[PDB]
Design a protein that fits this description.
The structure is a homotrimer.
Chain A: H1 7-23, E1 27-28, E2 31-32, E3 42-45, E4 88-99, E5 110-121, H2 129-142, E6 149-157, E7 162-169, H3 170-174, H4 177-183, E8 192-200, E9 221-225, E10 228-239, E11 244-248, E12 254-256, E13 259-264, E14 267-269, E15 273-277, E16 286-289, E17 298-309, E18 315-316, E19 324-325, E20 341-351, E21 354-363, E22 374-375, E23 378-380, E24 385-394
Antiparallel strand pairs in A: 1-2, 3-4, 4-5, 5-8, 6-7, 6-8, 9-10, 10-11, 13-14, 15-24, 16-21, 17-24, 18-19, 20-21, 21-23, 22-23
PDB class: cell adhesion
Keywords: Type IVb pilus, Vibrio cholerae, Minor pilin., cell adhesion
Assembly: trimeric
Amino acid sequence: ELMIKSSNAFDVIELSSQIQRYASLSKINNRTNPILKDNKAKEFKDADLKWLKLENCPTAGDVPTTGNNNDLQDQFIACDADYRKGDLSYFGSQFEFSTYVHPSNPEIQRQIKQVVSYFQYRGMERAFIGDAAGYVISEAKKKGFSAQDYRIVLIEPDRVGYFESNAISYEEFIENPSARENFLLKATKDRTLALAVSLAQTGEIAMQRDGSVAFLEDSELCWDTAAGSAKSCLSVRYDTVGNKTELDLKQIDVVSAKGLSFESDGKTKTPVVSTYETFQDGGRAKTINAIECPTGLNNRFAAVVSSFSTAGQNANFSSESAKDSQGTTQKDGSKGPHALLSGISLNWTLTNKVWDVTASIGIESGILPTSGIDSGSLLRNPKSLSFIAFQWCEN
Amino acid sequence: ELMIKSSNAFDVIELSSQIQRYASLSKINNRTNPILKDNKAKEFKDADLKWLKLENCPTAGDVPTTGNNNDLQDQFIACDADYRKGDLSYFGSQFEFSTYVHPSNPEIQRQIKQVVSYFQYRGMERAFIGDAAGYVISEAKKKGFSAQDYRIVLIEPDRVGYFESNAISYEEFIENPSARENFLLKATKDRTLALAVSLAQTGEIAMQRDGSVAFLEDSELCWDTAAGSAKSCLSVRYDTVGNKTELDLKQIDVVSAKGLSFESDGKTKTPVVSTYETFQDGGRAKTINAIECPTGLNNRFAAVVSSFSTAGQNANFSSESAKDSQGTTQKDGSKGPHALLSGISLNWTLTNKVWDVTASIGIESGILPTSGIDSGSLLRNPKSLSFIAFQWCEN
Amino acid sequence: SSNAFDVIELSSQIQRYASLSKINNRTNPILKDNKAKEFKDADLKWLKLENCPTAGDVPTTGNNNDLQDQFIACDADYRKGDLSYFGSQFEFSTYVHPSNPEIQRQIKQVVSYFQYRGMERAFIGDAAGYVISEAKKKGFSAQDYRIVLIEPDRVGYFESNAISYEEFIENPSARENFLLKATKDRTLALAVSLAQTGEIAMQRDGSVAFLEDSELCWDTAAGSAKSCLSVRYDTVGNKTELDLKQIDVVSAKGLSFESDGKTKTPVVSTYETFQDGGRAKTINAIECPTGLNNRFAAVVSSFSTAGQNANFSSESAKDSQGTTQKDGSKGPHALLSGISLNWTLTNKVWDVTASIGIESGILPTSGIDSGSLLRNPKSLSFIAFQWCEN
C-alpha cells in the first residue's frame, strides 16, 4: 500500500526514524556526534529541532558538516523542517545517558541509553489519543520503523527538561478502561498529554566502516566456516586478575602470519629461527645469509656448540644422526688418534647481509704439523664441529 | 483492513530476529548466556518469552544484567511484550546444540547449532497459512533476511517441548497442491499447525556491535590502506583436508604484537628470547634479570655453551666476533699454555625475578696455583667462556 | 506489499552495479560498448547472473565454489505494484582502457524509472513519499527527486515533462498543471537516482572495508587505547602492518610465521639428561600444523667426563664423581677429545644418543663404558629445541 492514511502519523514516523538514525551514530560528516560530548546523565532536546539540523543551514543547526560545503552532507531533516504540526505534535525528546570512555575517540564522554520522543496530543477530546497512537503504531510497521515502546504519558516541565508524572502503556490504555480513566484524571493543566516513543540503544547498532563504533564489552567477532554450523570467533577481553587486555585467538587452531614481531620487556623482536651448520673442506668461513628484518629492527645472531671432536679436517659432521671422525693430523701428515682439547671459539661478523662464522678448536701441543689448516695447536674452521645458528631481529 | 497480515508478519520477524540474536551471543551484559551453561543436545523455550526478558523487569525475566543499573543494559524485547496474538501466534522455539569447550569461559558447555521459532496458525481455514507465510517472508526480505527455507509444520507435545511430526516447504505448500493436501490430511485435532521460522542472514546484513552477526564463510575483514587501491585483508577459514581452522594474516606484511603467547601440545609458551653472556672480571656469580611473564605463566631459563677455553681469568670473550684467550695461569702466577679440559658446568637459580648464574671449568691437575680464582683444578666463573641465555615463560 | 522497500532496494543495487568496473573479477558488461546512452529494460535480464535458469548478463567467475556477487534474484520481477519498474537509463562518457580493447566507456549517470499504475494518478505523491522516507532512512539522498512523463526517444526515453517532488506536494496549482499533460503518448513515472550520503556499515559478506587508518575497537574496563587494532601502511618501508600493540597480550593456540619465504613455528626448548644405565633417550616430537615437518636440535649446556658417575638433572647444581678407572672404581676425571649429540626421527619419536670421547687407557676394558668412549652419559645436560617448518 502506497497511500498515506494519516499524514500526521506518517510524519511522526518519518521524524522518529531520523532521530533513531542520529542516536545510532558516533560520528556525523566525520565529526563526533555533538550529543555525546557532555557528561550529564540526561538532556532534553527542544521541539524546534535546531539540534537535528545541519550547522550550515541559513539559521545554523547543531549537526556538524564536513570541512567543505563543497561535498554532499549527511543530513537528518530539512533546514526548514517543523514537526510541531497536527494532532500529534512533536514536543522534543528526552535523551538518557551513561558515562562512557570510548576506546579511540577522546571527545566522547557518554553513551546514549535510551531516547524517548514526545508527541503532544492536540485533538479535541483527550481519550482518543488512543486511536491516534494506534495509527502511529500501524504506520511504524508499514514503514519498517522499529521502536522499543509506545506509551501514553503526562509530562511536566523540569529544572532543565521534562519528566513523566504519570505513564500508562498503550495496550493497557485501550484494553483496560479501569486503568485508562485511572490515568486521564491526572491530566491537569500544567501537565502535557503525549504519545511517547522510546528508542532503546541495543547491541543491534551497526559497526561503521570508519571504526567510530566499538564492539560491546565481552563480545566476539565471528566467522561461519566449512566445519559446519560452529562459528570461529575472536575477541579482546580484559582480565581483572592481572589487569591486562588479551586478544583471544584460541578458538582458532593456527594463527598464520607472514612477518611477525612482539615485545619482550619493552624491546621489539622477531621469533628466533634456527639452522644446523657445519664447515666445508678447506678451512674457510661458513657463510650464512642474514634473515630480512622488518622496518626498524636490526639483525642478531648466535652460534652454539652441538657436536665437536679434535679431528679438524678429518671429519664429517653434516648428518644430524651420525658423526664421522677420523682422528687428528700427526706431524707426518697422517691421521692418528684424537688429540685432547683445550677450547672452542665461535666468531661471527655481519658483512653485507651475510654472516661469516669462523671457528677454531684448541688442542694439546706437539701433535699437529707446524703449518696448514690444522697446525700448531689449532684446528681452523674445522669439519669436526657442528653448531646451531640462531637468527632474530630486534631494535 | 487486511494489512493486518503484513503487521502480524512484521512482529513475527521482529521477534524471530531477536531470538536469533540471543542465540548468537555467548555473553549478554557481560554474563554468560544462560542457554549455553547446560549440556543437553536440545531445549525448547516457552511461548511466554520470560526467558528472553531482562532480569531487572518488574516481573523478572532470565536475561542477565550487568548488576550496575547505571550501565546501558542490552535487551531483546520489552518487559511486557507478548507475541501470542494474531493469526501467526508465537508458540515457542526449539534450540539444538552440540557440546563445546570455550577457551576463555569455563561456564559454557554447549554451542548453538540452530534455533527454529514456531508460530501457530490461528486462522479458521488451515489452507490459508501459505498466504500468511508469504507476508512473513516479505517482512524478512525487508530486514535483510533470506527468503529461503521457510517451512510449514505440524508439531506435538512431549515431555521436553514440541517436536515436528510432519513438514512441508513453503514452496511445495504453494505450488504442489497434491503435496499440500497430503500434508494437511495429517493435521489432526491433536497437532498444532505452525509456521517454522529459522532466519538466515543475507550477505548484505550490517555487522552489529554485539557481535551477533558472523562473517560469511570465506569472507574477509579488510582495510583500505595508503598502499593504494589494493585492500589488506585477514580471514578465518576451515580446511576440510586437515580439519583445522586458520586465521590467515599473510596478506599483511608484518603482524606487530606487544605480549605474545601460543600453545605447544596443550602448554602455553611465550617466544624464546636470548642474550649473549660472559662473566665479568673477578670470578663471581652473574645476575640476569628475569623477563616479565604474562599472568599465569612461570619463568624458564637455559644457558648453552658458545665459546670456551681453559684461560680462566686470562681472557675476554665479550665480543661476538673475536676472542682474546691468553692461556692458563701457571704455578708461578704467569700466563702459560692452555691447559687441557675435563668439563664445563653452567648452573642457574631464580631468586626474586633475578637469575643467578654460576659457571666453572674443570681442567687437568698440577697446572694452576693452590690459591686464587683459578686454583687447584678449577676455573671459577671464568672469563674464558661465552654462553647464550634463553628465557621464556610457560604454564 | 513490499513496494517501497523494493523501489529503494532495486535502485541501490542498480547504483552499486553502475559503480562497479568489475563484477566477480570480470568486466562489467555495460562497459563493453561505446555509445553515450543505453536504456536497460524492465525485465531486468541484464541485472541477473548468467548462470540463472534463463541466462542473465551479469558475468560469473566460472567456478561455483564461492558465492557469486549478485544484485537481484533469478526470479525477481519488479514490474508489479503501483510503483512498477519501467527500466533504467544510463548515460556514459568515452574511455580508453589500458588492457581490454572492448571497454570503451564509463558511467556518468543512471536514473531508474518506476511507472505509476495506481488507481488515482494523484496518489503518486503519497507513493513518492514512502520511497523518499525509506531512501533517507537507509542513508541515501535522491538526486533531483521528481515525478515525470517520459516519451520514447532515439535511445531509451526522454523526460517530456517533470515536476519536483516538493512542488508536487506543496503546490496544488503546479500539480494538476503537470497532471493534465498526462496523455497517451507519455508514461507517468517516478525517477530515482540514489546517492550514498550517510556513512555505511561493515557487512556480513565482507565486501565493505574499514577506512584507511580506522581502528576496530572493543569496550573494556581498561579504558582508552588498550583494546583497538588496525592495519596501516608504512610509507617509508612500503610495508603493511597489523598493529596489535595496544593490547597487552596476543594469545594464540597454534602459531606460524614466515622467515625469508619459509613457514615456521616458534622453537620450543627443554632441559634434557640421560637416564641411568647408558640407554638412548626418547623425546616425543611436537605436533606439527598441516604441511609442516618436525625439526630437532640439541646443544651442549653442561658436561664432564664422569660418564655414569654423575647426576646433571638439576639445573642449579651438578654432581660429578669422576671417571671409572680400570679396576671399576671411581677415579680422577679423564680429559676430553669430543662430544657427539645425535638424533633421528622414527614414528613421531626423536631418538637421541650421545657420546663423549676421552683420553685412552682410563676406562676398564669391559662394562657400561669401556675403551675411550662414554655412551649416553649421565655427565651431560643438553637443551633440546623443536620447531616445525616447510
